[PDB]
Design a protein around this ligand. Sequence first.
Ligand SMILES: Nc1ncnc2c1c(-c1cnc3[nH]ccc3c1)nn2C1CCCC1
Ligand SMILES: [Ca+2]
Ligand SMILES: [Ca+2]
Ligand SMILES: [Ca+2]
Ligand SMILES: [Ca+2]
Length: 462
Amino acid sequence: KLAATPGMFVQHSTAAFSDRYKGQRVLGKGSFGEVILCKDKVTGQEYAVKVISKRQLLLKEVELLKKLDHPNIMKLYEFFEDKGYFYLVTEVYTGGELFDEIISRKRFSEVDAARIIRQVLSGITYMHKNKIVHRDLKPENLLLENKRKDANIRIIDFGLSTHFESTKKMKDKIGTAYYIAPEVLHGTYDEKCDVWSTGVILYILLSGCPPFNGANEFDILKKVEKGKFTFDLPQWKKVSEPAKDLIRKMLAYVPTMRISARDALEHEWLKTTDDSIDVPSLESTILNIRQFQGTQKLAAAALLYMGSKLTTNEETVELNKIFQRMDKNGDGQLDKQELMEGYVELMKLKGEDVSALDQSAIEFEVEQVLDAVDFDKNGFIEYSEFVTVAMDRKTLLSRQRLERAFGMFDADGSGKISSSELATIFGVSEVDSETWRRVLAEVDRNNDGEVDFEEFRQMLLK
Ligand SMILES: Nc1ncnc2c1c(-c1cnc3[nH]ccc3c1)nn2C1CCCC1
Ligand SMILES: [Ca+2]
Ligand SMILES: [Ca+2]
Ligand SMILES: [Ca+2]
Ligand SMILES: [Ca+2]
């Protein structure tokens, strides 16, 4: 098919960054280049851009980020290349670094730490599934989305990340003293390095101190390479055994003996909670998902575009909680069984009896929801797919958002969407005549062979 994915929408622009964005301030420096809070000149929306000098050549971080769609992974909007520069426009997270909260609150609640680590493990479980290793996980590269109390966590800085193969092992030495796994120092490593790092992070969150420390960089790396850490400090008397157990498993010296991300999610400890949802909100969401009816590809791209690239964080904070709670196994994907239990979970909340339920009837209904909603036909409902679908359709199809989507689709400004433009949107040479025929047959009002902003408008407004 034509697989509708958020990533397909980030395309190499041939406009000047300067024509559409305006620098506001410096947020900081990354793995390689600095990040500049910018504003879209026309919509006043804020993004965090990463600028990279051509002199200091690979836009690798862009390709990785297009393949990832996860509620705890940094979002990428678009990117510009210059004579001298690259610009990677991304969503801006306004709660700042975990690092700073660490040095502020000093020590984390087991509840808060479990939540945080769960989301990080979820991000990497997803990444590892897609053959990507981060390689530089630390509180610096974890952002709180906003200032709210128990803010969601985003992974950032994929500038040192790479594709890995189960066949051939990685050799380049990459990371940060406190967080680097011994095998990266040794010169041969795999995706388990990401676990080790996350295990270090966890240790810090719970105790306030790193597990391997030293007077300087060099001292630390020796301590790290020896692998030995202890729970000998007084603040550990306040922490539960399972938490230590997980830590042990995540910092097991030998990679093959160390827990995978995917398995770490299932650990006892990470199910530590205290945090609930309004029934109405959940009901709205569940009802919006049930009522999404599949459609032609122009509409699919449009909705996914609006849902994945044109929605702010403020708008999706509730949707984001729901998804994580419906994702029982953490992997960043909703599956048929997860979906089934969601509806059941809601049914308990409504008093309706679990026993008196046609399990197979529901399971059937769920198969059909999945079919409607799974934009890329990978058998899973990903976050942006979920948002597009679960958001209130009048909220999503605000009169702004509609105008903005159409603009993006009508690349030559002709006031009409052509099949060539649609192909362009999908990142593919041409749209199957079958598909386009299917598309026009449902939309073309004047019947001029193309879709204008009224034809477009009503297409979605159903
Ligand atoms: N997206 C962001 N939103 C908010 N704050 C951000 C960032 C980034 C950041 C991290 N990785 C990025 N890759 C491409 C752009 C980009 C931006 N870095 N930072 C801050 C500046 C460095 C430390 C925290
Ligand atoms: Ca799942
Ligand atoms: Ca999907
Ligand atoms: Ca056109
Ligand atoms: Ca027309």
